[PDB]
Design an enzyme around this catalytic site. Sequence first.
Site, mmCIF file in Angstrom:
data_model
loop_
_atom_site.group_PDB
_atom_site.id
_atom_site.type_symbol
_atom_site.label_atom_id
_atom_site.label_comp_id
_atom_site.label_asym_id
_atom_site.label_seq_id
_atom_site.Cartn_x
_atom_site.Cartn_y
_atom_site.Cartn_z
ATOM 1 N N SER A 51 0.833 -1.211 0.000
ATOM 2 C CA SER A 51 0.000 0.000 0.000
ATOM 3 C C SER A 51 0.865 1.258 0.000
ATOM 4 O O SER A 51 0.341 2.351 -0.200
ATOM 5 C CB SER A 51 -0.932 0.084 1.209
ATOM 6 O OG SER A 51 -1.924 -0.970 1.207
ATOM 7 N N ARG A 231 3.255 -1.205 13.665
ATOM 8 C CA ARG A 231 4.097 -0.421 12.750
ATOM 9 C C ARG A 231 4.193 1.008 13.287
ATOM 10 O O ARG A 231 5.287 1.579 13.412
ATOM 11 C CB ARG A 231 3.547 -0.474 11.311
ATOM 12 C CG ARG A 231 3.586 -1.860 10.670
ATOM 13 C CD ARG A 231 2.701 -2.008 9.427
ATOM 14 N NE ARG A 231 1.313 -1.638 9.806
ATOM 15 C CZ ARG A 231 0.340 -1.543 8.906
ATOM 16 N NH1 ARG A 231 0.624 -1.839 7.635
ATOM 17 N NH2 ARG A 231 -0.894 -1.233 9.295
HETATM 18 C C1 LIG Z 1 -1.629 -2.225 1.835
HETATM 19 O O1 LIG Z 1 -0.441 -2.464 2.109
HETATM 20 C C2 LIG Z 1 -2.726 -3.212 2.100
HETATM 21 C C3 LIG Z 1 -3.712 -2.680 3.133
HETATM 22 N N1 LIG Z 1 -2.972 -1.823 4.084
HETATM 23 C C4 LIG Z 1 -3.514 -1.982 5.254
HETATM 24 C C5 LIG Z 1 -2.759 -1.316 6.366
HETATM 25 O O2 LIG Z 1 -3.132 -1.508 7.484
HETATM 26 O O3 LIG Z 1 -1.662 -0.701 6.118
HETATM 27 C C6 LIG Z 1 -4.600 -2.827 5.289
HETATM 28 S S1 LIG Z 1 -6.150 -2.128 5.408
HETATM 29 C C7 LIG Z 1 -6.392 -0.882 6.709
HETATM 30 C C8 LIG Z 1 -6.510 -1.482 8.114
HETATM 31 N N2 LIG Z 1 -7.955 -1.532 8.399
HETATM 32 C C9 LIG Z 1 -8.551 -0.342 7.772
HETATM 33 C C10 LIG Z 1 -10.049 -0.584 7.552
HETATM 34 N N3 LIG Z 1 -10.740 -0.722 8.845
HETATM 35 S S2 LIG Z 1 -12.098 -1.630 9.026
HETATM 36 N N4 LIG Z 1 -12.710 -1.140 10.427
HETATM 37 O O4 LIG Z 1 -11.644 -2.977 9.215
HETATM 38 O O5 LIG Z 1 -13.048 -1.317 8.005
HETATM 39 C C11 LIG Z 1 -7.765 -0.247 6.459
HETATM 40 C C12 LIG Z 1 -4.465 -3.675 4.038
HETATM 41 C C13 LIG Z 1 -3.835 -5.053 4.217
HETATM 42 C C14 LIG Z 1 -3.457 -3.378 0.764
HETATM 43 C C15 LIG Z 1 -2.506 -3.601 -0.356
HETATM 44 O O6 LIG Z 1 -4.447 -4.418 0.905
#
Ligand SMILES: *C(=O)[C@@H]([C@@H]1N=C(C(=O)O)[C@@H](S[C@@H]2CN[C@H](CNS(N)(=O)=O)C2)[C@@H]1C)[C@@H](C)O
Length: 245
Positions: A51, A231
């Site tokens: 991401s 992180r």
């Molecule tokens: C990117 O690297 C991936 C994407 N990045 C995430 C991150 O945490 O850096 C997650 S999604 C992020 C965590 N939960 C939020 C949504 N909340 S909820 N309450 O569950 O709706 C968004 C994810 C793995 C990407 C490439 O998939």
Amino acid sequence: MHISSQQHEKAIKSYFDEAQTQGVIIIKEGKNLSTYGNALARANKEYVPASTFKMLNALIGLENHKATTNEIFKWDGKKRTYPMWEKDMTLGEAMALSAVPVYQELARRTGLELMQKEVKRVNFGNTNIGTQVDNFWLVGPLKITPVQEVNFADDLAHNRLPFKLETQEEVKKMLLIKEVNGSKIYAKSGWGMGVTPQVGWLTGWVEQANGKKIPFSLNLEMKEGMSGSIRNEITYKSLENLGII
Ligand SMILES: *C(=O)[C@@H]([C@@H]1N=C(C(=O)O)[C@@H](S[C@@H]2CN[C@H](CNS(N)(=O)=O)C2)[C@@H]1C)[C@@H](C)O
């Protein structure tokens, strides 16, 4: 200051040790790179950006008029991995939620040919996007090192990437994640779940009250069991230990 560099190195290494992972955080002050953590050799190893690529995806899309900052990308009504993704959002909101469906839409609007040209033009990572415009930052072939990520963050923080100033400013506004006694932290997280082992990122910069920008890139191994917030917690403890915030 009065704290030894040995003491600082031991403290930051211990943040990674205590999380039971392997990782590094690179800090840049001016032109000088510093590497900390419990696995320093990760600094010049290549991993997928996951991401974190959304920073560059957004710059490319805005620069080439494939989206505006107020455009609302509508949820198509299909089930998503995360409920927070099942809603209508701007690029900025999608950046904060790491909503990959919105950024896949943006990448498809840019298209493979222009995407390859721009990624090459920016010199990002190994610069290789392969033949699939909608997943190249997730599963390969695109890869980048923590050193390259910290230098990317340095270039964006200083408006040095080859995009209009306005494009850079619009993306940086999307990345504010934390305010700490006068300091602001801009960053993008990453969690690459489509590779093995899984990679975790938090790449960004601190803007101190006086205007100085101190870029950083954390990179670690995420393991099933771990909370994404580790992180941020490691990063903040590290910047605090060094007196950056
Ligand atoms: C990117 O690297 C991936 C994407 N990045 C995430 C991150 O945490 O850096 C997650 S999604 C992020 C965590 N939960 C939020 C949504 N909340 S909820 N309450 O569950 O709706 C968004 C994810 C793995 C990407 C490439 O998939």
